[PDB]
């Protein structure tokens, strides 16, 4: 189908933004140990919101790209509107680049005045730092986009894959609406903040990721659509049965009742299961491939996504999800460790996985690229992925020492925040080194095209 | 074991836990007046929340252990900087003197905040320190 071509601008832009994300990561990582680096021009918080918003935005672009590509094929017809897909692309790209520039070009409080935050105050919450007009512009893009892809499903064949993807996509946009709700009571603000972050990343985004995985396995493996889609329903069932009460693992210390200590701990303890099932899923249906596939990189991307999502979300998630432990590790370099591995292993990797399947047959080159291009992609895969495990090991060691020095001893014996950070210095230099190897990976990956 | 079976486990699981979740959030939301001491949630604390947001303190600091990990936990800072009595007065100095300019050290910005703004900040943080947080953090260092 020809309207599958509108996915290309989405995947390209996403990869450009991904580069920006890594550079601002590297700036912050240096700021950790040379604390006045780039100060006062780009204070760490400005660098941080660039890093974290570039991550959310580029992943969103990959998702829309992924939907624009596979929805036509599933639905067995042309996309409701290519000209819509392109108008939305430039609106979203300009709105993204605009809000990022606001962050860098005006002190935050000035950007707040300037965008009239005081009428509808939604700014200065983590991951949600974009002006209210930027948020509004994202909702409008998401409505367009959902109509575009949702109409295509309507007049076309329904499949479980495409309907789980749409459910996830709709859920994402809906939950995003809670970013407009900024209570005056701090505990209430935190309580609802997690309906965005947690119900995205351990709920609705898992429908998106799983749908993308299932499609790639349908196309790569020649295994029956019926069995693939069964396991897809099992996986997302386990996602939401663990995940919804699971939100509670963020409700231990924000000021809500202590029953959340139990509820949060017990259901979160089970949230690894879907990522475990996604590894049994990808490995088994690639093992059972009725046919070989010219692009052997995608198969690697799909196996690796599921192992990394499982290591990052499942294993690191679990290591700190029990309240008696989280009590000590809350808000610590351990959190940063888990968060890096989980966002990379689940979400960055699934976007690169669908790029690996779709890029050749979108630039009209074929199923796969020449064999030089394919060895690079794999190098960029191992370099990024291995670097990230090291990023997470070095931060995990930092987090363990932080907990020991700062969190465990009593008053008088416990080391101050600032002093314990000097003690962590080596681990932060080493992470910054790993961060360099990762960029070299992203560049190597990018030189595959 | 069929597809249809799996899809209904998904359907029933999600509705039931969605409804369990909403019911818990109804309950939880009833307890918040006492837990957070909303009685004390003054116009001053609510204005402080706005200055906390407008200057993105959370982009460098944690509050109740959430936010960024560059700078210290501010949920309980009030207890490390002369308590109830003298904390407001500390904070005024603290905001004026930034950046400290110590070579190689993590640096905090100068926000050119008015005295009312900083006082509202101090109330917000004081009040935040008193939320019943199930005894978090472990000690006075946050």
């Amino acid at each position, epitope marked *: 189908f020809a309207s599958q071509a509108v996915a290309k601008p989405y995947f390209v832009f996403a990869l450009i933004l991904f580069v920006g994300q890594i550079l601002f990561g590297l700036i912050m990582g240096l700021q950790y140990v040379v604390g006045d680096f780039l100060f006062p021009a780009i204070p760490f918080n400005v660098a941080r919101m660039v890093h974290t918003n570039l991550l959310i935005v580029w992943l969103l672009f990959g998702f829309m790209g992924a939907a624009y590509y596979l929805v036509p094929e599933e639905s067995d017809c042309e996309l409701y509107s290519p000209k819509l897909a392109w108008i939305l692309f430039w609106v979203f790209a300009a709105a993204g680049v605009l809000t990022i520039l606001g962050y860098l070009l005006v002190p935050y409080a000035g950007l707040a005045r300037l965008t009239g935050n005081e009428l509808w105050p939604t700014m200065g919450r983590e991951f949600l730092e974009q002006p209210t007009i930027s948020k509004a512009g994202i909702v409008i893009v998401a409505l367009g986009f959902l109509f575009n892809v949702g109409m295509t499903v309507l007049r076309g064949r329904k499949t479980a894959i495409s309907m789980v993807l749409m459910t996830g996509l709709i859920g994402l946009a809906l939950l995003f609406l809670f970013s407009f709700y900024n209570p005056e009571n701090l505990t209430r603000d935190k309580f609802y903040w997690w309906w965005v972050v947690h119900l995205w990343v351990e709920g609705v985004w898992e429908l998106i990721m799983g749908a993308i995985l299932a499609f790639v396995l349908v196309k790569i493996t020649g295994v029956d659509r019926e069995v693939i889609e069964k396991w897809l329903y099992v996986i997302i069932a386990m996602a939401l049965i663990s995940g919804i009460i699971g939100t509670g693992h963020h409700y231990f210390w924000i000021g809500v009742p202590g029953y959340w200590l139990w509820l949060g701990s017990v259901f979160s303890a089970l949230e690894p299961l879907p990522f475990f099932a996604m590894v049994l899923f990808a490995f088994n249906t690639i093992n059972r491939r009725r046919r070989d596939y010219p692009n052997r990189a995608v198969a690697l991307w799909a196996m690796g996504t599921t192992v990394m999502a499982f290591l990052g979300a499942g294993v690191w998630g679990f290591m700190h999800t029990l309240a008696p432990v989280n009590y000590y590790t809350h808000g610590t370099q351990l959190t940063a460790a888990h968060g890096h591995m989980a966002f990379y292993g689940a979400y960055a990797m699934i976007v690169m996985t669908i790029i690996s399947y779709a890029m050749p047959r979108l630039r009209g080159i074929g199923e796969a690229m020449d064999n030089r291009s394919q060895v690079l992609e794999m190098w960029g895969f191992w370099l990024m992925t291995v670097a990230m495990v090291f990023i997470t090991l070095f931060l995990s060691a930092a987090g363990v020492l932080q907990v020991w020095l700062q969190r465990m001893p009593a008053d*008088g*014996a*416990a*080391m*101050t925040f*600032m*002093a*314990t*950070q*000097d*003690q962590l210095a080596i681990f932060y230099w080493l992470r910054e080194g790993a961060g360099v190897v990762f960029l070299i990976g992203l560049v190597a990956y990018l030189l595959s095209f | 074991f069929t597809k249809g079976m799996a899809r209904n486990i998904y359907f029933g699981g999600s509705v039931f836990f969605i409804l369990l979740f909403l019911a818990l959030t109804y309950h939880t939301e009833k307890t918040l007046p006492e837990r957070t001491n909303e009685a004390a949630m003054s116009a001053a604390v609510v204005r402080g929340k706005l200055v906390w947001e407008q200057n993105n303190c959370v982009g460098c600091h944690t509050l109740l252990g959430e936010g960024a990990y560059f700078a210290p936990e501010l949920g309980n800072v009030v207890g490390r900087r002369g308590g109830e009595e003298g904390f407001n007065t*500390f904070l005024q*100095a603290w905001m004026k*003197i930034q950046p*400290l*300019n*110590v070579p*190689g*050290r993590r640096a905090m910005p100068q926000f050119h905040l008015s005295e009312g703004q900083v006082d509202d900040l101090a109330e917000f943080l004081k009040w935040s320190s008193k939320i019943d947080t199930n005894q978090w953090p472990p000690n006075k*260092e946050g």
Partner: antibody
Amino acid sequence: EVQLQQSGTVLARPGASVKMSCKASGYSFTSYWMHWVKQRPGQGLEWIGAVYPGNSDTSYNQKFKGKAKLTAVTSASTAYMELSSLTNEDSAVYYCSRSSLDGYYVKNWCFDVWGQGTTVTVSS
Amino acid sequence: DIQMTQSPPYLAASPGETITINCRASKSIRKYLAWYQEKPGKTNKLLIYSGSTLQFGIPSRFSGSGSGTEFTLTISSLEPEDFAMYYCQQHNEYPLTFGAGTKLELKR
């Protein structure tokens, strides 16, 4: 309240040694450099050195490398200074004091609290 | 080592008046000069650091200025308790060094 309590007057003979203490309270002892400062009568303050109790590292003015040895015992929050091969010139008041800032890399800063001083009198 | 010379060594003045005292470094210490007040029966008290930053709790009648090599301390309207010994200390480099003091005395 941050406080530093220093030990009492010590008398010693020339060529002997003396060891004094500084008991810290009201803060994280392991998180701040403890400095030691000499004052002889109408003679101007002199920085002897400092110890970082968080990792036991020390730093000495070259003029006191021979003379002074600095230690800390963290269970007790007390820092110690031992002065050896005493001479009339070591007769003075000796102060400990706390870096006003926390952490290892702020070795050269100012001090926000001082001890009341320990007198060392060297005589035959 | 950077050497510090304070002047004048003695200054007489009266309650309600303003004085300013000097501190000179033998080489540049950028902006890193602190000041301490010394009084009998009391531990030394940090007044100012980094040239002009007032230490927490210190009244605004104290102020300081300078960079590189030349620094001052001013008290705006002397109070009875301000008559005391004043020392400066450089905090730009190892080894830390101090000036020998200006003694501010009560005129009668």
